[PDB]
Amino acid sequence: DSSLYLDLMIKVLAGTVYEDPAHRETYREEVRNEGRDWPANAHTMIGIKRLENIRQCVEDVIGNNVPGDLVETGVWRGGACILMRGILRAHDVRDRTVWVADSFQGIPDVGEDGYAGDRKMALHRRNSVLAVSEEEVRRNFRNYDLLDEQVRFLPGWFKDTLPTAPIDTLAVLRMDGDLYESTWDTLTNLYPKVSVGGYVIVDDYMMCPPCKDAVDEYRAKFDIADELITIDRDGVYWQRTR
Amino acid sequence: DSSLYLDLMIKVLAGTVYEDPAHRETYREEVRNEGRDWPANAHTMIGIKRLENIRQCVEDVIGNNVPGDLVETGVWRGGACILMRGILRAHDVRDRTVWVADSFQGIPDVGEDGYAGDRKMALHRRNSVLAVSEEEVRRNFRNYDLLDEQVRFLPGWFKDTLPTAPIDTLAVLRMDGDLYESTWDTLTNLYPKVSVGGYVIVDDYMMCPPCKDAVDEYRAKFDIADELITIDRDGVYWQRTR
């Protein structure tokens, strides 16, 4: 029911239910299951396994009454954040907010002074696909009837928005910002808000050297020993215990 | 919950949630709301208002315990029938079947001996869009996780399949066969199975002269005075009371 709803939402968001093909820049269920393409029209690129991970983490924080809001840093068309809001709706949770943090202009051009690994990737060149306006994201929330007071937006570059984001505590921090600098700025500003029992999800860890660098360096610097658990061929997560 | 699920299902089936454009043979919400286009990819052409009518009728027969199975005669990609099965699932109804009746080859070519109104329309020429195989319909049910024992298929021309269909009683009869002959063959064979309290839905009444002819003639012949109620700019329905 809530369970039928969330099951269907995952299938709709990833576009498996309507066999949404990969972006011009075929549909293969095995590829979509692991989030290994960019859907032409669907609302998230993270795939079924990473959507299921969001569901499991958010349901666990609700079931264990771990305090805090939910956030995604790097949202594209908004589908992962739509799922977060839908899970709250399914469980009639009225006292948590979903924070939708993005430039709404794609990946920054890190320039000559960027982290070497970020410069080498030149991921801003992918902005023809990766830049999605806030108006489009809002419309996507409205399409699911989920644009309401429990959704809040943090538009701008993370280095500008996250230090002053008016978030008190976080139960789930989902990071999907593609660069060393984006990931570092997310962890430095938002990890201290994560409650004990809460989760940090790293979208692109195994196959993204600069993202792997940022996560490992932050964890080493702050002696975070909570183990990284895999999700699929790309993502990992951990639960904060201390 | 069941209600969140069914709300989302209607939006997914019609393709409003992902703004599915009209078939090559733009997306406009007002057009999709009234079922006035053929979606490029979505699973039904009947639109939001006609999907909502199915929901209301099926929920009413469940809530009033009107006996019988559910059937659609003319299914295209299967979306109206997927909704019927989903409503049963949402309410944990295990003792009704959804019957999916179609040629799976599009509209018949009525030939020189067809009803004059059917011959003039030459709707078989639209089969490039209207012919959808049973394999495709089955796959669509599977995409929603709704292909199970409570879905049954009646493949073939209605004149061949309906006289011997092993249906005992019907709580909802949804007719969407586009022709005088299709509509007449549906009513003659299946209306006698409709329980008191059950519903007959006519997809294409107001703007389809041959369909209007068949429904009105059948109702006049059998003295059916239960009033026709409108749905949108096209469909009507009635409830059997006697």
Ligand SMILES: Nc1ncnc2c1ncn2[C@@H]1O[C@H](CSCC[C@H](N)C(=O)O)[C@@H](O)[C@H]1O
């Ligand atoms: N430093 C930064 N500041 C703001 N937005 C950033 C950023 N680095 C990356 N982004 C954003 O990160 C996103 C990467 S794609 C995110 C995919 C999304 N989680 C999904 O469910 O499909 C883009 O929307 C991009 O604009």
Ligand SMILES: Nc1ncnc2c1ncn2[C@@H]1O[C@H](CSCC[C@H](N)C(=O)O)[C@@H](O)[C@H]1O
């Ligand atoms: N005499 C007949 N026998 C079998 N199938 C028929 C028929 N006349 C029309 N059809 C079928 O009627 C359908 C019309 S389109 C139906 C639309 C569908 N109800 C929806 O939800 O989108 C086609 O699939 C066509 O194959």
